[PDB]
């Protein structure tokens, strides 16, 4: 429903891109007081409570955000460093990244990169993954990610949402195919 997503659209950048210009402070481990997360979201929606936003985490289906005693927190897509849990994803054996063509020089010599985020965000879902890629132009591709070569390689891939997984980057032997 439409007044669920607008105000986990806003808690998701507040949390990942600028907090401070919100007036609130994460600590190491990117987590703010949900009160004064709470007081943050109504100077924009003064319909909203903190029992409301108690039930987006718990109901957001991607994983996006994680509560723990009274602060809260983005589980990934941050733009500041922060400290994650490091649940390491083992089992995966392909990974997702999907991106515009027009990145393809880059990616295919560089490999992936964290960008203006802290990590490289990859999926193990195929879809979600182009659906990402679209967001940055109309022509994607599909990266298909060798989970076991970033391993090898020392790259621990972490277990940040449903889908969505974190790596510090991707190195191009990794990226087995651009599709
Ligand atoms: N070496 C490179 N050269 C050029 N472009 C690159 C390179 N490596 C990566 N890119 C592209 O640089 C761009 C970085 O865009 P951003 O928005 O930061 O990353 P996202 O698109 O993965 O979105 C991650 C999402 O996952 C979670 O939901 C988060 O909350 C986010 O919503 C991509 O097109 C990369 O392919
Ligand atoms: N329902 C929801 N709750 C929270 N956040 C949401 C969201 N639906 C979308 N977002 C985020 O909005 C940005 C633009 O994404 P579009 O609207 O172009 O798809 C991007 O966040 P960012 O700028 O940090 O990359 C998305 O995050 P996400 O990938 O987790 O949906």
Known sequence: ?????????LMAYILRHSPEEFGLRPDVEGFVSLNELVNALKTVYPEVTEEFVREIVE???????EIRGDRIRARYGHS????????????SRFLYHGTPRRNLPS????????????????????????E?????????????????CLRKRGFK?????????IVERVPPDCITLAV
């Open 157 to 165: 891939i972490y277990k940040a949402g449903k889908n969505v997984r």
């Open 80 to 91: 500041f460093p922060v400290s994650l849990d490091h649940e390491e994803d083992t089992e």
């Open 59 to 65: 109901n957001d289906p991607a994983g996006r955000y």
């Open 1 to 9: 429903k439409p007044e669920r997503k607008r105000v986990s659209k």
């Open 132 to 148: 990402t890629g679209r967001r940055h132009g109309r022509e994607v591709v599909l990266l298909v990610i060798d989970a076991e």
């Open 107 to 130: 990616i295919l010599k560089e490999g992936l990169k964290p960008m203006k985020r802290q990590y490289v965000h990859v999926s193990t879902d195929k879809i979600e993954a182009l």
